[PDB]
Design an enzyme around this catalytic site. Sequence first.
Site, PDB file in Angstrom:
ATOM      1  N   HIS E  36       0.827  -1.200   0.000  1.00 55.35           N
ATOM      2  CA  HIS E  36       0.000   0.000   0.000  1.00 55.35           C
ATOM      3  C   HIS E  36       0.863   1.252   0.000  1.00 55.35           C
ATOM      4  O   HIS E  36       0.554   2.230  -0.691  1.00 55.35           O
ATOM      5  CB  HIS E  36      -0.939  -0.014   1.206  1.00 55.35           C
ATOM      6  CG  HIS E  36      -1.951   1.089   1.196  1.00 55.35           C
ATOM      7  ND1 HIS E  36      -2.400   1.695   2.349  1.00 55.35           N
ATOM      8  CD2 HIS E  36      -2.603   1.693   0.175  1.00 55.35           C
ATOM      9  CE1 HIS E  36      -3.286   2.625   2.039  1.00 55.35           C
ATOM     10  NE2 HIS E  36      -3.426   2.645   0.726  1.00 55.35           N
ATOM     11  N   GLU E  54      -0.272  12.090   6.033  1.00 54.83           N
ATOM     12  CA  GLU E  54      -1.675  12.236   5.676  1.00 54.83           C
ATOM     13  C   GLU E  54      -2.353  13.244   6.596  1.00 54.83           C
ATOM     14  O   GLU E  54      -2.082  13.297   7.799  1.00 54.83           O
ATOM     15  CB  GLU E  54      -2.387  10.884   5.751  1.00 54.83           C
ATOM     16  CG  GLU E  54      -2.183  10.139   7.061  1.00 54.83           C
ATOM     17  CD  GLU E  54      -1.022   9.167   7.007  1.00 54.83           C
ATOM     18  OE1 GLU E  54      -0.316   9.139   5.976  1.00 54.83           O
ATOM     19  OE2 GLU E  54      -0.815   8.430   7.994  1.00 54.83           O
ATOM     20  N   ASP E  97      -5.686   9.066   2.202  1.00 52.65           N
ATOM     21  CA  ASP E  97      -4.319   8.729   1.814  1.00 52.65           C
ATOM     22  C   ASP E  97      -3.635   9.897   1.113  1.00 52.65           C
ATOM     23  O   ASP E  97      -2.466  10.198   1.384  1.00 52.65           O
ATOM     24  CB  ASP E  97      -4.319   7.489   0.920  1.00 52.65           C
ATOM     25  CG  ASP E  97      -4.455   6.203   1.709  1.00 52.65           C
ATOM     26  OD1 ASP E  97      -3.418   5.663   2.148  1.00 52.65           O
ATOM     27  OD2 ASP E  97      -5.598   5.732   1.892  1.00 52.65           O
ATOM     28  N   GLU E 110      -8.844   7.462  -2.698  1.00 51.01           N
ATOM     29  CA  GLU E 110      -8.514   6.346  -1.824  1.00 51.01           C
ATOM     30  C   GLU E 110      -8.051   5.179  -2.682  1.00 51.01           C
ATOM     31  O   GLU E 110      -8.702   4.836  -3.673  1.00 51.01           O
ATOM     32  CB  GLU E 110      -9.715   5.941  -0.966  1.00 51.01           C
ATOM     33  CG  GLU E 110      -9.472   4.710  -0.110  1.00 51.01           C
ATOM     34  CD  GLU E 110      -8.690   5.016   1.153  1.00 51.01           C
ATOM     35  OE1 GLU E 110      -8.416   6.207   1.412  1.00 51.01           O
ATOM     36  OE2 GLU E 110      -8.349   4.065   1.887  1.00 51.01           O
ATOM     37  N   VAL E 111      -6.927   4.576  -2.303  1.00 52.87           N
ATOM     38  CA  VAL E 111      -6.288   3.533  -3.093  1.00 52.87           C
ATOM     39  C   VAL E 111      -6.205   2.255  -2.270  1.00 52.87           C
ATOM     40  O   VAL E 111      -5.855   2.284  -1.085  1.00 52.87           O
ATOM     41  CB  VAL E 111      -4.890   3.969  -3.581  1.00 52.87           C
ATOM     42  CG1 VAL E 111      -4.008   4.384  -2.410  1.00 52.87           C
ATOM     43  CG2 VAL E 111      -4.240   2.854  -4.372  1.00 52.87           C
ATOM     44  N   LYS E 124     -14.685   1.272  -0.588  1.00 54.20           N
ATOM     45  CA  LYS E 124     -14.159   2.620  -0.413  1.00 54.20           C
ATOM     46  C   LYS E 124     -15.216   3.668  -0.738  1.00 54.20           C
ATOM     47  O   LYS E 124     -15.279   4.719  -0.087  1.00 54.20           O
ATOM     48  CB  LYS E 124     -12.915   2.816  -1.277  1.00 54.20           C
ATOM     49  CG  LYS E 124     -11.739   1.937  -0.873  1.00 54.20           C
ATOM     50  CD  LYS E 124     -11.576   1.884   0.639  1.00 54.20           C
ATOM     51  CE  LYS E 124     -10.306   1.148   1.033  1.00 54.20           C
ATOM     52  NZ  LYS E 124      -9.801   1.584   2.364  1.00 54.20           N
TER      53      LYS E 124
END
Lengths: 48, 211, 97, 49, 216, 434, 48, 49
Positions: E36, E54, E97, E110-111, E124
């Site tokens: 991630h 973040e 993120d 958002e990943v 998500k």
Amino acid sequence: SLDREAQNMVVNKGICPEDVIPDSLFSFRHTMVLLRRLFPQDSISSFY
Amino acid sequence: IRDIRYQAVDAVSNVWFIHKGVKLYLNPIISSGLLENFMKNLPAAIPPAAYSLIMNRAKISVDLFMFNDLLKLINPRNTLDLSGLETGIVKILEPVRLIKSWVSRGLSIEKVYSPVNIILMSRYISKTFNLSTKQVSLLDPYDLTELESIVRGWGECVIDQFESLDREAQNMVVNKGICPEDVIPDSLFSFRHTMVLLRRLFPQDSISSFY
Amino acid sequence: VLATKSSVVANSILSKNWEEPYFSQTRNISLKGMSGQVQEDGHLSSSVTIIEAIRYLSNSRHNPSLLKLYEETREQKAMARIVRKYQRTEADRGFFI
Amino acid sequence: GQQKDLAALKLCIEVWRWCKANSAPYRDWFQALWFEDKTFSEWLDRFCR
Amino acid sequence: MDKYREIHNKLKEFSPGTLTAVECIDYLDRLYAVRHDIVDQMIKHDWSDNKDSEEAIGKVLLFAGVPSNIITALEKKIIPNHPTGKSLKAFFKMTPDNYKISGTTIEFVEVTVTADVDKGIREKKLKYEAGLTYIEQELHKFFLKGEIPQPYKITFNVVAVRTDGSNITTQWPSRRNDGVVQYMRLVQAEISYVREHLIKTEERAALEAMFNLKFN
Amino acid sequence: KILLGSLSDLPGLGYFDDLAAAQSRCVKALDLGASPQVAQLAVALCTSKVERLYGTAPGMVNHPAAYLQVKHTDTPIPLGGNGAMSIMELATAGIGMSDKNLLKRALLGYSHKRQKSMLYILGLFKFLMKLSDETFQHERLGQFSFIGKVQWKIFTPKSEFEFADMYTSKFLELWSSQHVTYDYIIPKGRDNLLIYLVRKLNDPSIVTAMTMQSPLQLRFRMQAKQHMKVCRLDGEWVTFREVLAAANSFAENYSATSQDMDLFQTLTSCTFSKEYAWKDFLNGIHCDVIPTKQVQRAKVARTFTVREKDQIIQNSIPAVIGYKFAVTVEEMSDVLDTAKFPDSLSVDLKTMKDGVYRELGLDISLPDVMKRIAPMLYKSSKSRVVIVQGNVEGTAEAICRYWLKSMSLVKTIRVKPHKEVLQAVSIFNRKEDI
Amino acid sequence: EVLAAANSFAENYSATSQDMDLFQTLTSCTFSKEYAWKDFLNGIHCDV
Amino acid sequence: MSDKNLLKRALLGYSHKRQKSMLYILGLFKFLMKLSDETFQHERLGQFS
């Protein structure tokens, strides 16, 4: 003479190369893992 | 006579039985410790796979067919040549119904599978041994039973999803070295026993490994 | 009085474990009497908690929680009956099932 | 040792009698079944000896 | 990155079948964290936004010039579409993120890295877009009432990359796909090694149960 | 209420089980406030009733002395036994403590000198264990503790309960053998929970409880009074006299074995739960009468706990045992759900194995070894509430001392060893030391 | 010094299952057929 | 034989009840064995037991 005897023993009936005991203080597992770690081999050839 | 230890009875070779033209294979009964129940007409419990093995013993289980399909996916022309079908005094008059009375569902010893180790070991077996030499129909049923036991359930985890699993196996084996004697396909696998069984079933010229 | 103990009240309510399976607890598989289903003659059947639990588990496809079981059987009408044989268990207190 | 010999003899008696009552391969079974560390045929030979 | 190097150093000294189930689980968790992180870094360098730490949604809005009084007033409101009925204050507490501010437009992304792209995308979405859209309506109403000179535009984009990185270029037509997919293939091989080989054969069921509870 | 309800109800599970039920509920009556003398009288009356019903007492057919070369007192309780123990030992030590004391005495006698009367008791215990290892293994788990017992017939049809005839008995036995982790933890998924509940329904104790106030129970009583086939000797129904004869035949030709000695010591050795040594406490205690008039104080309820849990093991013993025995993924999920500290399960198992290896030569790594030794090592942690008069502290020692002072109905009693003589001891004693 | 060391070692000695087995090995019977003189003398009686 | 009788009595005392005076004798015997296992092993072979 020893090489000829070994050939005679291995050609006529099958010998599995994991039961050969060269001497009373030999372990196949330990020797083979030591030789693998000292001399790396590409595991792709054994699996592909 | 009392104090007969039927549970200590073990079988090494095939233990067949005939009744009105019906052929029976009593090795699963002996290995499961149910020889006394079969002899004296007593109730017992067996999984359906054991029932299928006892009754027919001439039709290979679906596990062997799935393993053959897996080997075909890995490398054809090295698959098992399959030609069989799928799936004091006591007197016994209905052994077939006696055994059918023992059949029930849920008493199966499922094992924890490893999806990548299964495919790795299948390909190791495919390359090391030539499986297209001896007909499986003429193989010893005693050894075929043990092979089916050690390969049971492998197909159910890899045929449905194979390409992703094969790519993961390649990724795992190419980057860092894997010794093909530590791969554990499932919790009920022994490398030594499987390899000696496969050596005995499929002979290989030992000169090639030593010369 | 209760407003000064809000945190402990919330903790006690949440500690009742509403998310565990309903039939995994001892109290729901005990031998306490429980009314069964309506028979053909029209009389409610006197039964036991364990038998009714087995019946529901056999009919259902999963072991639901307390909230899930209530939601599934919300439309079911409540029924009651007087025991056939009184007591019958050291943990059986009352006269209704 | 005597207890093990007695148990083996009794078990061989039982399996033989059962094979007698029905139609069973006497010798084939006796070359197949195994008890402790000695097969049934070897148990028969030891009983003869 | 260096985390992958430390993980590799720790795991090349462990013989096969000598790791307890909990050790395998936490090593796997570290490896997923590394994957991630490396995807976060590729997106970081793609957008050239050196936001190493973040920041919360409230902090991001503060960087966008949003006055604090209206944020404090909105903190008392409740999301009507939230599945769990979480307050706006907690939704402001959490940190996405990555983020970017371009005039009156703010982009939130958002990943996640997983095999099931659709499942991660929808998870998500249900986690972020409800609160994001509620904030969008709140700021639109504030603009209509006249407390801000210019309305704000919010955009949420979720991208899930498969474990093999086949569709990473399709979703992210970046110049740096090759190195990232090579690194992620390496970490995937590491994960497979840890899960399938290094685990003791007597605790494989324990590993499977712990993995199912933690991730499924 | 309990004293008068101890008489009419017949458990019908056999001599040992009926005697244990009567004694246990007499102990409960003592807990609720009964004087030890009244409790002793009730114990004697119930023991006489059960002995006459089963014929155990000397003077009729089922007397053990007529079929065993061992004294009536030295015969195991499952056979013809003398259930005339003191209420003190019943309340403090337990119900099956007579068998434990007999086995301890037999092993002590076997050492020093090798006689035959004590090896006879060892053979009787081995015969009892052989009889016990022919039924469900979870029967020994929980309930009253016993080395082994004789199984008795169930004189009620299985068709009375609707779902009893869903899984066959052999199915249940093989499922229990395959899934041993479910003896210690309750299954969560319906696939295993349904089988667990069906096995629970066929339990003889639960069947009798469900048929406790029914006319069907007179069948067993009339069979027992008429001395018919009510017990098991191998796969056949046999009479109690046949069981006694078989026990004598097995014990007269029994040879001691090192592994058998180790297992007998395992039974005799300490427990996984911290247990107070009541035997040496009572043996070494002394009571003195003080000439003081009796003073009637109020009544307060105190929690008398006899079995605690070692604090070193962060998880419950059933959880750790099930985790060790669990081999399937779903069993592992169930044991993780039940366990409060899943991460420490491996540490607890390692400490368990280390303690067993330290105190015993037995190694729990082998599944058979742990399977055989777990029920004799782990015992339940049930808590009790005892009504006490005055300032009795909430400790087991204080409740026991209050019971000692309560033996005399009129005279005040003083206990000479007034110090703390607690013996909270477990298998794990030197683990921190080592 | 030997006596003091023996006292120090014995005052802080913890029994062990293997140690118990070895002590029993010492106490147990012998590989040679031995007559039990202890119980013979204990149970003997002489009369004038 | 005096040492053998003492050890037998000590083990008998250790059972039944767990005292300290007998475990003291056990510790003395263990100390003696520790002292003995520091010289030639054939000394214990033969001669007095």
